[PDB]
Design a binder for this molecule. Structure first.
Ligand code: SF4
Lengths: 467, 164, 159, 92, 100, 270
């Protein structure tokens, strides 16, 4: 079909952000200024949030055969935009101390927002590929931003080779499915012969690298230690939040995901992700590796809901609310880590042994890390508990007894390291945009508390979005 | 047709084996160029007329030129030869060779289960990709241009020049 | 057939190694007869100037670089022999260390002498050993009856 | 045909080569800065979309020219960006 | 007259060989070489899948796949540039910190 | 005296024949032999796509343009394996800078050729030679024609004048370490290159096989001869441009020119 004004209003998120890249690139070539580039980039992402209202004026419809725009995609675009908003506000205080070329940062984050808001809208297997790679190239390059350290370059190179490897597995799987089926459109796929299933397993490999699943999780510690903390805010939250939407939509639409042959394999990956995350996560004394270890377990809880997407309609809202709660928890925690590095400081010295005290140093910021760190676990009065509660309900609904038991025993194992960091901020002690960065994490603390005690308004938004 | 496909596929296989067995890099670059030429021959034999000639102009005419530049400027020939051959023994080659061979035999067993339904070398001209690129796939082109801009800026950045 | 000999007569590549002096006449010749001459590509080397003891290894490396068929033209009295500089710093002729085929006396020789050197060198290239039992004829002997028959010359008080 | 001419060319190559045989560590600041050629490696891929475009443009029409103008405008913005930052300048 | 299975097993063999080259060697140049080999294997599999059904579905993402190959090879080569600019040793065991 | 211009080249080719070949020590041997034919066979097979006659067509294949671009891109490898086979950091860097400016100035020809192949709409050369039946595709595309001219004269045709010498010190021209028949191979390669670029220019931009009042094959031959003489006239008139000025007037000036050229042809064709 051609371009109609309905299609342009539907495409408005992918458009405002793209116009922002052009204006930011022209502004970089004009002046090369940090203040103007930060202002121009954050205005475009805020303009994308405003235009989410305008696409809500439009209904559930297609733009091209590549994309389908539903109300589900409206919420996922919003999650990615607040993470992009969150990462630029955490990057200005870290980059003020950087020695030179301080302006390429917002350009790459803007490209990654294009990639994230393109995996929200998906209907064809090719859009899946244009999105994964649009976000990886900034994540190829931003973990290597400030390569002057001996580990940022190390982290960039390890992530670079491995992410190209996953994309090559995804592309080879993407074709081996299309050999049987006449089209690669998600809906048109599956219209249980082994080549289609074999092609499907290859896409699971190429998707489970970025979702940090059990035999592909090896990158998640190292780059999270190596990357800058502003990059870790985006790498923990936005990428996997955007990626989880497209992998859920493929199994919802495709009739091959209805068959139990793929279901058993994904359940075992989810089982082992919880276990192989929450057991190796105990011994760590580094906060960045600690959050990277928890990421593997959080994506595992998302999978134990996704396996029962096909049994009961409550799994849609369950995945949605756990993603919202998981966004807020990780942004607050990673913002405090980045807010401790108020200058560039070369290599930031962050560790669990380095976080003795921190209440008599900065009391407000210690409270935010504690609230979010209790929210990661499953303690009530926090939004993580309501998200944990729906995934338990989904597993009970679909009679996945081993999987729901894994979440409980994984929660039982994983309570230990969250609580040490919560109490280690209470042992004996050994600029304007910085106040803005404090405001972002403090705003998130208020939100996770009020949506843990009072969780109904977030459910109303989620059922408003779900089709 | 059958003999041409068989001989160019075997040429590609031999070039792929050759590029993964030698030590000197320039032989590997030459053999990889030969393999790419064989793949373009496969593309022309199948009937993908806009693929065999599109691969050479770009994949074997620009990117491999970048590989040639970096392997030429490192001047790694004549230094660090002995320890790489010492470490790369046949014994450590067998190790992961069988592990990848399990993958190979699994995908061979997967592909032989379907029927043949053989297709002739149907020729596809550029006139129809000029429509398919312009049909549903226009935003793919736009976001691919943005992808290429992203690659340009991250390659300019992380390859930053300095005084040294 | 001897087509190869015609090939070598028809085309020759000159390597100009003229030194401080004596090369201005060689340039006068070259700009009338002819950036084409390149090292390790030429088969003819026109040694001119005073072969100094210090720079003789340069001439020996350039002689080594060229291919198997090597021709050398010595120009000037300073290159055929030591010339007027029979001194510790001048080698007494370039033929001491490289074989030479044609000798062009003078100080400096004229461009026409260079032209006649190319003519005698294509003539030598067209008779093939290299001597071939034809090069014993000498310009001392060939034009002898021409030169002896000269009787009168213009008086030197006129222009 | 093309195959006959290719066989003739490779036979001539074999004839000339056989006839010829019978006839008888640290660079420091030097080199580097090939990144103009890397800019070519990426820009040829950008222009490959125009390579595929040039075959079918009459049926493309007004939106085709519009989004081709957008594409080359993005390329022009990137080029002036690289010029103005100092990446594309005098190079060894 | 060749059906799809022969071309697909050829692409699978090149896929496996590229993966093995990515695994076994030490030089990052050689892992990038195997990466590009295995990208080409996936592209070949896609092209034979596209030309199996007899429509214009093989040339539509192959161009973008080789675009990805170009961009990835360029950024990887620039990373190798700056790595050798930092440290003269080109082994992966030099950059092998944060183990475990 | 010799009455023919070609007889000098004939004697030169005979001279390059029967010259002893020396082995270089501490050098690779396969690339020392292979670098000439990457420069020679490329522009030899660039001749395989000309419609010299409907009845004596050298190849009736569906696509000739992509083959030409594939040879254009391939040509760089000859300068690169020559640079590595030089085995002298001076000469190697000279061949690296020569291949640099080569890749830099080879960009333009494809985008300039998009205009003519878009107003032609086909890759089979019979369609192009039948397109120039009444109006040639040179009147509207002046900028594209001159851009393709610059690109065609920039591919190792000696117009840059950095091949056998180097404006920059610490490096040297890359035609020095080859002195046997391979040097004659270089010259014959650039000769087939210039004649094939001229033939492609006449048969793709102007109208081949028109025949107003005389048989059209000699009409094509005489027009090709006039463009040969004009190419030699401007090559001789063209002075050596230093490396800097070539880098200045490269990607800056002619990429926008060809982009607005594509815009103009796309706007006027519909
Ligand atoms: S021959 Fe005469 S001009 Fe030549 S170097 Fe000797 S003295 Fe000078």
């Amino acid at each position: 079909m051609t371009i109609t004004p309905q299609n342009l209003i539907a495409l408005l998120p992918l458009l405002i952000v793209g116009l922002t890249v052009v204006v930011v690139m022209l502004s970089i070539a004009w002046r090369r200024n940090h203040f103007l580039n930060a202002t121009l980039s954050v205005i475009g992402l805020n303009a994308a949030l405003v235009s989410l209202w305008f696409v809500g004026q439009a209904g559930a419809m297609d733009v091209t055969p590549l994309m389908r725009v539903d109300g589900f995609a409206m919420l996922y675009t919003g999650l990615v935009l607040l993470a992009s908003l969150a990462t630029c506000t955490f990057a200005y205080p870290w980059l003020e101390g950087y020695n030179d070329n301080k302006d390429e940062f917002y350009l790459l984050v803007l490209i990654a927002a294009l990639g994230g808001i393109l995996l929200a809208n998906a209907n064809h297997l090719a859009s899946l590929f244009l999105g994964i790679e649009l976000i990886s190239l900034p994540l190829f390059g931003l973990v290597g931003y400030a390569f002057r350290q001996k580990r940022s370059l190390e982290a960039s190179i390890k992530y670079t080779i491995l992410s190209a490897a996953a994309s090559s597995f995804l592309l080879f799987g993407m074709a081996l499915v299309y050999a049987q089926s006449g089209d690669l459109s998600f809906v048109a796929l599956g219209k249980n012969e082994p080549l289609l299933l074999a092609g499907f397993g290859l896409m699971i490999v190429g998707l489970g690298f970025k979702l940090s699943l059990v035999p592909f999780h090896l990158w998640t510690p190292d780059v999270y230690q190596g990357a800058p903390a502003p990059v870790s805010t985006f790498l923990a939250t936005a990428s996997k939040i955007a990626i989880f939407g497209v992998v859920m939509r493929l199994f919802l639409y495709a009739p091959v995901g209805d068959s139990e042959a793929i279901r058993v394999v994904l359940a075992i990956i989810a089982f082992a992700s919880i276990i192989f995350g929450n057991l190796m996560a105990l011994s760590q004394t580094n906060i960045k590796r600690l959050l990277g270890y928890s990421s593997i377990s959080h994506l595992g809880y998302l999978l134990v809901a996704l396996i029962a997407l096909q049994t009961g309609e409550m799994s849609m809202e369950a995945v949605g609310v756990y993603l919202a709660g998981y966004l807020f928890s990780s942004l607050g925690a990673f913002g405090v880590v980045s807010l401790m590095s108020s200058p560039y400081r070369g290599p930031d010295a962050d560790s669990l042994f380095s976080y003795r005290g921190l209440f008599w140093h900065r009391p407000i910021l210690a409270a935010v890390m504690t609230v979010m760190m209790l929210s990661l676990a499953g303690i009530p009065m926090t939004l993580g508990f309501i998200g944990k509660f729906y995934v338990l309900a989904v597993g009970v609904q679909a009679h996945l007894w081993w999987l729901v038991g894994a979440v409980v025993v994984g929660s039982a194992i994983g309570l230990y390291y969250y609580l040490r960091v919560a109490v280690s901020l209470y042992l004996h002690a050994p600029n304007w945009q910085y106040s803005a960065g404090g405001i972002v994490v403090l705003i998130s603390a208020l939100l996770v508390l009020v949506l843990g005690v009072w969780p109904q308004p977030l459910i109303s938004i989620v059922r408003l979005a779900m089709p | 047709m059958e003999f041409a496909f068989y001989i160019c596929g075997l040429i590609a296989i031999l070039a792929t084996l050759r590029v993964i067995t030698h030590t000197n890099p320039v032989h590997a670059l030459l053999y990889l160029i030969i393999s790419l030429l064989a793949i373009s021959g496969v593309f022309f034999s199948l009937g993908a007329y806009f693929a065999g000639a599109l691969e050479i102009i770009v994949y074997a005419g620009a990117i491999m030129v970048l590989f040639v530049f970096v392997v030429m400027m490192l001047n790694l020939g004549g230094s660090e030869i002995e320890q790489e051959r010492q470490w790369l023994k046949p014994q450590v080659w067998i190790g992961p060779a069988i592990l990848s061979a399990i993958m190979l035999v699994v995908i061979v067993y997967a592909i032989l289960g379907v029927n043949d339904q053989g297709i002739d070398g149907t020729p596809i001209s550029a006139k129809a990709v000029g429509i398919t690129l312009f049909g549903p796939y226009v935003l793919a082109v736009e976001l691919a241009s943005m992808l290429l801009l992203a690659g340009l800026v991250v390659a300019f950045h992380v390859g930053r020049e300095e005084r040294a | 057939n001897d087509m190869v000999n015609w090939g070598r007569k028809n085309s020759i590549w000159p390597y100009n190694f003229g030194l401080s002096c004596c090369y201005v006449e060689m340039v006068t010749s070259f700009t009338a007869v002819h950036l084409r001459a390149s090292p390790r590509q030429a088969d003819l080397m026109v040694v001119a100037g005073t072969c100094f003891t210090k720079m003789a290894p340069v001439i020996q490396r350039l002689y080594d670089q060229m291919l198997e068929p090597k021709w050398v033209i010595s120009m000037g009295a300073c290159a055929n022999s030591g010339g007027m500089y029979d001194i510790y710093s001048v080698v007494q002729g370039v033929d001491k260390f490289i074989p030479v085929d044609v000798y062009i006396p003078g100080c400096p020789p004229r461009p026409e002498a260079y032209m006649q050197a190319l003519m005698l060198l294509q003539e030598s290239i067209g008779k093939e050993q290299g001597v071939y039992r034809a090069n014993m004829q000498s310009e001392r002997e060939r034009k002898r009856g021409e030169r002896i028959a000269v009787t009168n010359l213009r008086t030197p008080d006129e222009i | 045909a093309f195959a006959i001419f290719l066989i003739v060319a490779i036979g001539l190559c074999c004839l000339m080569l056989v006839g010829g045989w019978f006839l008888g560590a640290r660079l420091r600041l030097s080199a580097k800065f090939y990144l103009v050629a890397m800019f070519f490696v990426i820009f040829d891929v950008e222009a490959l979309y125009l390579f595929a475009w040039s075959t079918s443009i009459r049926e493309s029409g007004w939106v085709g020219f519009v989004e081709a103008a957008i594409f080359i405008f993005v390329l022009l913005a990137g080029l002036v960006y690289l010029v103005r930052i100092g990446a594309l300048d005098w190079t060894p | 007259m060749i059906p799809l299975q022969h071309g697909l097993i050829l692409a699978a063999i090149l896929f496996v060989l590229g993966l093995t080259g990515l695994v076994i060697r030490r030089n990052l140049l050689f892992m990038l070489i195997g990466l590009e080999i295995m990208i080409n294997a996936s592209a070949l599999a896609f092209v034979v899948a596209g030309s199996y059904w007899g429509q214009t579905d093989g040339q539509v993402m192959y161009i973008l796949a080789i675009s990805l190959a170009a961009a990835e090879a360029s950024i990887g080569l620039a990373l190798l540039l700056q790595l050798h600019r930092r440290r003269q040793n080109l082994n992966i065991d030099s950059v092998s910190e944060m183990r475990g | 005296v010799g009455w023919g211009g070609s007889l000098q080249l004939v004697a030169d080719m005979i001279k390059m024949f029967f010259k002893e070949d020396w082995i270089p020590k501490f050098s690779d041997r396969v690339i020392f032999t292979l670098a000439p034919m990457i420069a020679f066979t490329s522009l030899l097979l660039a001749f395989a796509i000309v419609p010299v006659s409907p009845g004596w067509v050298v190849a009736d294949l569906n696509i000739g343009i992509l083959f030409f671009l594939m040879m254009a891109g391939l040509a760089v490898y000859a300068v690169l394996f020559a640079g590595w086979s030089s085995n002298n950091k001076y000469s190697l860097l000279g061949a690296m800078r020569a291949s640099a400016q080569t890749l830099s100035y080879e960009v333009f020809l494809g985008l300039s050729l998009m205009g003519v192949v878009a107003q032609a709409g086909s890759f089979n050369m019979t369609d192009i030679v039948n397109s120039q039946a009444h109006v040639w595709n040179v009147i509207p595309q002046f900028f594209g024609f001159i851009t393709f001219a610059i690109a065609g004269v920039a591919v190792c045709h000696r117009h840059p004048f950095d091949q056998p010498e180097a404006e920059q010190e610490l490096a040297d021209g890359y035609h020095i370490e080859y002195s046997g028949m391979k040097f004659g191979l270089f010259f014959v390669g650039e000769y087939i290159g210039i004649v094939t670029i001229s033939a492609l220019m006449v048969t793709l931009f102007f109208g081949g096989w028109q025949g107003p009042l005389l048989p059209p094959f000699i009409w094509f031959a005489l027009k090709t001869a006039f463009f040969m003489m004009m190419f030699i006239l401007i090559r001789a008139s063209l002075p050596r441009p230093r490396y800097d000025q070539v880098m200045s007037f490269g990607w800056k000036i002619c990429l926008p020119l060809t982009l607005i050229n594509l815009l103009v042809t796309a706007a006027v064709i519909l």
